[PDB]
Amino acid sequence: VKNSIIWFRKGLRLHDNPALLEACKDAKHVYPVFVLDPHFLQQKVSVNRYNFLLESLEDLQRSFQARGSRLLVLRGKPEEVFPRVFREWGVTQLCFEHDTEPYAKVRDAAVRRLAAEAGVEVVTPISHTLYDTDMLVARNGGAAPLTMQSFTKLVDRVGDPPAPAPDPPAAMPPPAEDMPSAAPAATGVPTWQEVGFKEPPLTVFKGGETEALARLEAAFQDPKWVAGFQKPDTDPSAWEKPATTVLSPYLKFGCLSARLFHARLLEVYRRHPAHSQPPVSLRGQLLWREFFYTVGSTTPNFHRMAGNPVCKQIDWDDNPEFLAAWREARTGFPWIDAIMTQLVTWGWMHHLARHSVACFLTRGDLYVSWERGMEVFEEHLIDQDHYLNAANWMWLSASAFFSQYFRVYSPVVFGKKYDPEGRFIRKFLPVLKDMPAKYIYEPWTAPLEVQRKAGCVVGRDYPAPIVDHAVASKACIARMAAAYRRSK
Numbered sequence: 001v002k003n004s005i006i007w008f009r010k011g012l013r014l015h016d017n018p019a020l021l022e023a024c025k026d027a028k029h030v031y032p033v034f035v036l037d038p039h040f041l042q043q044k045v046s047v048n049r050y051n052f053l054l055e056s057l058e059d060l061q062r063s064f065q066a067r068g069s070r071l072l073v074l075r076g077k078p079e080e081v082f083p084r085v086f087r088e089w090g091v092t093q094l095c096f097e098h099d100t101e102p103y104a105k106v107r108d109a110a111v112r113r114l115a116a117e118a119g120v121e122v123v124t125p126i127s128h129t130l131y132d133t134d135m136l137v138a139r140n141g142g143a144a145p146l147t148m149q150s151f152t153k154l155v156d157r158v159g160d161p162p163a164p165a166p167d168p169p170a171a172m173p174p175p176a177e178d179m180p181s182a183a184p185a186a187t188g189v190p191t192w193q194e195v196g197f198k199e200p201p202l203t204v205f206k207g208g209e210t211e212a213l214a215r216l217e218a219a220f221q222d223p224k225w226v227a228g229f230q231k232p233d234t235d236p237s238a239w240e241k242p243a244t245t246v247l248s249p250y251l252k253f254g255c256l257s258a259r260l261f262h263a264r265l266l267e268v269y270r271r272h273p274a275h276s277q278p279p280v281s282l283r284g285q286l287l288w289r290e291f292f293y294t295v296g297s298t299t300p301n302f303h304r305m306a307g308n309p310v311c312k313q314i315d316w317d318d319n320p321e322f323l324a325a326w327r328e329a330r331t332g333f334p335w336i337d338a339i340m341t342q343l344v345t346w347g348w349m350h351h352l353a354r355h356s357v358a359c360f361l362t363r364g365d366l367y368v369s370w371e372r373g374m375e376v377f378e379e380h381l382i383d384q385d386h387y388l389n390a391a392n393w394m395w396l397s398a399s400a401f402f403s404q405y406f407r408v409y410s411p412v413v414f415g416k417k418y419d420p421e422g423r424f425i426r427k428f429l430p431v432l433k434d435m436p437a438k439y440i441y442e443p444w445t446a447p448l449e450v451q452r453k454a455g456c457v458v459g460r461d462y463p464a465p466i467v468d469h470a471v472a473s474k475a476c477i478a479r480m481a482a483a484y485r486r487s488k
């Protein structure tokens, strides 16, 4: 008889889950398993993202319970847990979604070895990406495209991605009864207090497949807005109603299927002939995700500078004071400090907001390595994706994919073209709420009488700017030009 395990790591969803569909096929018992390392924090991870993962697991639990099953959160390491439950549960098949991250290949290789010893068939379908990214590389001649222009030509030659997989049955083969490793007291979903965190999460985005599908429909309520979507023209200062979909955390954890997102975009596109095209279109945004996954999975040391064949070697400054001020949102520039405050409170900022603070830290003002900025994003972003965070940090630092280092965002002017009153600033930096809009982006320029009348004296309640942008930007551009000339 067939007893199987569906191992959740990413792909925290029931829709478009070919691994789950194969696990339930002709199965007498199915064990939905997520492996939680209980000492993960005691070894980096904000409570905002970890609680998002936990809320995503609670959503899977309810979905399984509605179908007569149960989600099993096993404590420990996969290499130590699976060899035990293979014998205990009489497992004949192990199914999980393919993952191309560096740690994933080392972990999946070991588990695959352990399954062959126990006589367990391993099925690893691809469903986290639009395509089999290794197939894209093989069709391009054995190397991934290095520009979006050529990558879009490749996917158009390959054709449409696979359709979303059908929904699982309304009743699933259940786990066996009175199995010791499946005891409810040892397999339940923990809370954020139970894992070790002490401060509560403050983000307004809730995890889970149910929330992902709800945000998908909300985005498609206006098909005209989807058809004409142009990413560079969206508003980074919009926070009450974000200017983009905010589907990144759900695609990162696999709460939302990328193939379902793509399939519903094409339905809209067939009825709107003048729809936007890549790379600015909403579909083009999924291709940015696919493109960075394709290059990252085939590039060694893609998440670093040294040993990275696609990354340019720039001698970034080792400046802990600039890094600390940027990380703690005390740069003296309200536009920059507000985005960093949204980072630690929400764990999500608009794409152009991430452009502003990443340029400021790297090639724009402070000249700190993009690796240090990536480590700060990795801690707080609820959508932190190994390949996307690294690639976009190399883009903004002009270390790869992007080379126009003369385009430098102003920490003053960039925000006031969208938000002259500075509602985004007043929201996340309440200390500046009573500051007149004439000085909200440059509060040091406000006369002392206005600073006192607003209850925000620069140097006492809000710090002075750490650098003069005109001086600092002119220095970074000169050093970037020297770094490029030396990298022939």
Ligand SMILES: Cc1cc2nc3c(=O)[nH]c(=O)nc-3n(C[C@H](O)[C@H](O)[C@H](O)COP(=O)(O)OP(=O)(O)OC[C@H]3O[C@@H](n4cnc5c(N)ncnc54)[C@H](O)[C@@H]3O)c2cc1C
Pocket (backbone or CB within 6 Å): 231, 244, 245, 246, 247, 248, 249, 251, 252, 285, 286, 288, 289, 292, 349, 350, 351, 352, 354, 355, 358, 377, 381, 383, 384, 385, 386, 388, 389, 390, 392, 393, 396
């Ligand atoms: C320094 C920096 C770091 C970033 N780190 C991350 C990260 O860790 N995780 C992450 O998901 N994105 C990251 N991005 C990309 C981008 O800023 C976010 O994907 C975007 O803000 C998500 O909002 P949205 O879901 O509303 O996007 P939409 O515009 O609605 O796009 C829809 C989806 O397309 C994908 N997408 C959109 N823009 C990009 C892009 N530039 N690169 C790759 N995929 C994209 C995402 O999956 C996103 O959910 C980073 C960008 C910068 C500049």
Ligand SMILES: [Cl-]
Pocket (backbone or CB within 6 Å): 408, 409, 410, 413, 414
């Ligand atoms: Cl600008």
